[PDB]
Thioredoxin-1 (Saccharomyces cerevisiae), 109 residues
Amino acid sequence: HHHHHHMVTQFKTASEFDSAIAQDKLVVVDFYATWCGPCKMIAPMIEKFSEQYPQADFYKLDVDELGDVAQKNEVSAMPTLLLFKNGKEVAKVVGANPAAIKQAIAANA
Ligand SMILES: [Zn+2]
Ligand SMILES: [Zn+2]
Ligand SMILES: [Zn+2]
């Protein structure tokens, strides 16, 4: 019954980031870079999760484009999946293990 899609939306600016995470719902943010190997390896999992948890909003952020947002959120390892609810970080999953990311989403959705 794949009658519609959910997307992993790319943040354009810091202000869109700030507003998006303010919501009263799980917001999942994949911090990546085009140079990042493990990020590409986990991209497929994150896309699938976005359509597995339609009650959460999924986004991605290119640290080459919004390195400032990355700096404010203390993202260093890559990929980093940051999860927020009501303006507050609720998980910070570091690295490329799909199992941990899945546990974190399931915990917070
Ligand atoms: Zn149907
Ligand atoms: Zn789809
Ligand atoms: Zn749906």
